[PDB]
Amino acid sequence: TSQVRQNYHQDSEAAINRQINLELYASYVYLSMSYYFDRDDVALKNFAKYFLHQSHEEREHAEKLMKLQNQRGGRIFLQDIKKPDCDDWESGLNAMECALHLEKNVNQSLLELHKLATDKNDPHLCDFIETHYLNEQVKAIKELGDHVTNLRKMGAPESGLAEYLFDKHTLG
Amino acid sequence: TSQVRQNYHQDSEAAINRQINLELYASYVYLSMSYYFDRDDVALKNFAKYFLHQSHEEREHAEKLMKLQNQRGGRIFLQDIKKPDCDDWESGLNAMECALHLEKNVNQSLLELHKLATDKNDPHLCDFIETHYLNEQVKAIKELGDHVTNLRKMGAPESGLAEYLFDKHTLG
Amino acid sequence: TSQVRQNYHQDSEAAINRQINLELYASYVYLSMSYYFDRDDVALKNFAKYFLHQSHEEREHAEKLMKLQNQRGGRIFLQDIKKPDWESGLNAMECALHLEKNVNQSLLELHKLATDKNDPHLCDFIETHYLNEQVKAIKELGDHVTNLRKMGAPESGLAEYLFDKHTLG
Amino acid sequence: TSQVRQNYHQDSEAAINRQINLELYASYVYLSMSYYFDRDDVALKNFAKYFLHQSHEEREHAEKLMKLQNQRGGRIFLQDIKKPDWESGLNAMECALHLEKNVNQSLLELHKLATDKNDPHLCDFIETHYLNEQVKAIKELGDHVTNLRKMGAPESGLAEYLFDKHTLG
Amino acid sequence: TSQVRQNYHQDSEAAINRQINLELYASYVYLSMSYYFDRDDVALKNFAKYFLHQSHEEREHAEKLMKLQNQRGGRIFLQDIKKPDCDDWESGLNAMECALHLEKNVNQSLLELHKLATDKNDPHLCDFIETHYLNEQVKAIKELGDHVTNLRKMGAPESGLAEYLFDKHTLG
Amino acid sequence: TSQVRQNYHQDSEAAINRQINLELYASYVYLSMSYYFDRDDVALKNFAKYFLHQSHEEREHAEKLMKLQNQRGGRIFLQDIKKPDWESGLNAMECALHLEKNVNQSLLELHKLATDKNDPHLCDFIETHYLNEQVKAIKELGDHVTNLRKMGAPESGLAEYLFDKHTLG
Ligand SMILES: [Fe+3]
Ligand SMILES: [Fe+3]
Ligand SMILES: [Fe+3]
Ligand SMILES: [Fe+3]
Ligand SMILES: [Fe+3]
Ligand SMILES: [Fe+3]
Ligand SMILES: [Fe+3]
Question: Between chain E's N and C termini, which has fewer beta carbons within 10 Å?
């Protein structure tokens, strides 16, 4: 047992490790989306810039959890990072919806982790999640929701002019 | 025979000379396209800048090949620069498609030139093509693919508003 | 078929996609090593810095291949990123040396392939952006392994401490 | 017919199109001369700079005419750019003098035309941007030809070397 | 056997070592030429700087190959550096002519090294030579030819005024 | 016979020429030592930088001797540069100490010659530019040799690691 472990439940340790896989998985999904819009038959350079930035942020969510695992005296166990659920993403509106679905699933997992940490009376772990994860997710979901709303009002996906302008005037 | 010639086959010398004519030809074509959009009844000022920039680049592609010819001890032979295959280019999408066909023809001639240079064991000429031409054509061709793809999704060529906005927000 | 594809074989495409997976696997392997050295019972902070930097660089190798796939008109296909396969720093440097040689052999098979299909663009891309990077990387890891062994690693904990302060610092 | 065309005769349009071709032809001639002096068996680098500079300038004369064609509502029609028709530096400077006088004679034919068609804008365009350029250009080439003759060109290779160093540098 | 060696043929290693000797020999030749023109009865200071600059450039060619040898896991094996083939070099034109012949022999050795590297499927060694050696030799041969051509046009070597002015106005 | 020669004995001229070869030989030795320490199974980067510096410094000694030869009116005659005659860092420093002592012994024989032939200028050249450089060179190498032995070289690889970082860095 670690010389620094104190008030760190085994269940919290296992859940952090599963959350690390989830954050890495989300990074893969966003990385997949990005280069889909980098394709010459999609060619929305700013969508690809948007999803690539999100891919790097999820990777940082993961590295910071690995850092916490060590801080509390637990032990990282890594798993496979499953491939994303689409190779082809149809459109910019459709992609924004999948990102909203994914970011909501990450939030649901972070809220289960906080419920667990409260169950185990782990205030440091509770406030770690509240500080670094919970509100970041609240803004990502509100942000992704604004975009879906606008892309729909403009005539996406049937109007290719709509996604061009959105990609210029919102994602630029 | 030149005091500097070494490992430079006749066939490579002849091919460089044909490649010089092609590069000047592409310069003439983009120059033709450019001022077509400069006309008051077409009047897309940024399409004309995009193509004028490309016309100046092909002139640099040719002059650089003329420079290599002298470096390797061969002798420049100049031919007529044939007039472009269209005087009226229809629209912006159509110009972009002819630009893509032309850059692909230039690329195929360079690939034959590198196949030639490999078969004649001219490693210096091979690296010349790789450094100064092959990756430039890959980017010109992917770039033109992006523009064609977007112009079609925006509703070109039947929608003149599309080419107006594309000229403002992409070629600006 | 893609409007930009020209002189890009289907085998070259399939290999680029396979190489993308390997580069991402290499990033995962180094990331695993890094935070191993961040553990309080290892506590070699510069070892952890070194491996984390190499992890991010493999992510740069992978994204650049995804960029090339689109440039040539091919289509990205992603697979699972398999989890890595660490005792001490000398032992980690040795697995990294084994890993960069494996990534290197995969790149040489891809360049032999691109040479066979007469793809001079893909040949130069591999030569330019990947091949000399692996030669530097492997020579560097070889230096570290060599030095760590002469100082008395892994049996000497003073050795890996000092190597972490004066070489990786 | 163009919504901007006003007092621009069809003969003036046809002639501007011919003058465009000649300007591009002159650029080709100078481009040919330039890289001739870049050859290792000629090796007069400032002669080669000089002619390349003139090649880019004739290209600037041509593109300005393509601009005027559109300003008046006319329509550009392009033809082939004929290949140029060099022994030494004095010989090249003399062929350049013959060429600039032919471009000049063509421009004066264009101004007589514009005068006959009562096109004062086209007249001042030629007076402003081309006529004094040709007079300058021809006086310059004459100065060089005169000097290279007095120094002993072309049989004296010391002459063309020094001229390349001290006048064209 | 080296822990870093991978796809490096014993023949390529042996060829690098011989090329190391040739680059040091070329360095010796230029150094000999340089101080020949420093002599009080020749007294062309800029010819002597020019060859001295070339002597140092060849040493850099040697040290960089000594670096590659170690990078690929081979073993440097040094030989005698044989003295240059002339003590007196007659004039500046004759020295430039021996420099031209010397760079052509160094180039021919490099083309044989690349042919070797091609036939043993060492693309890294193939590109090293292309990047750092092949075009440097072409420019070096093109430069030496220009100087040779110009010196002969001025009346060298029988005209001492010719080599004086060349030393002032070209090599100054 | 040269128009500048005055009080320069043939033996001194011949002795300068032999000293030129010895300096180039010392340069070959240090360059050989340097890249030995660049090897991945030796991997002491600062030893390799130290010897590379000395290799370049010996080349400066030779060229200055080539400069004096022309200044006094003698004639440079070059010979083959014989290949160098390395185990560890201590052993390399010991051959370097041995080498500088032979270059020094040759310089003191050159100064004895110059004194016997009444060449005060050549006497000053050796005094100013060479003799004290060698004393500093030999005193330094002895210091390094002394320290390596105290730290446990060559049987202690940790000793040469630390010496390379803390003295030669
Ligand atoms: Fe996240
Ligand atoms: Fe081109
Ligand atoms: Fe990699
Ligand atoms: Fe290459
Ligand atoms: Fe003109
Ligand atoms: Fe060289
Ligand atoms: Fe010395």
Answer: N
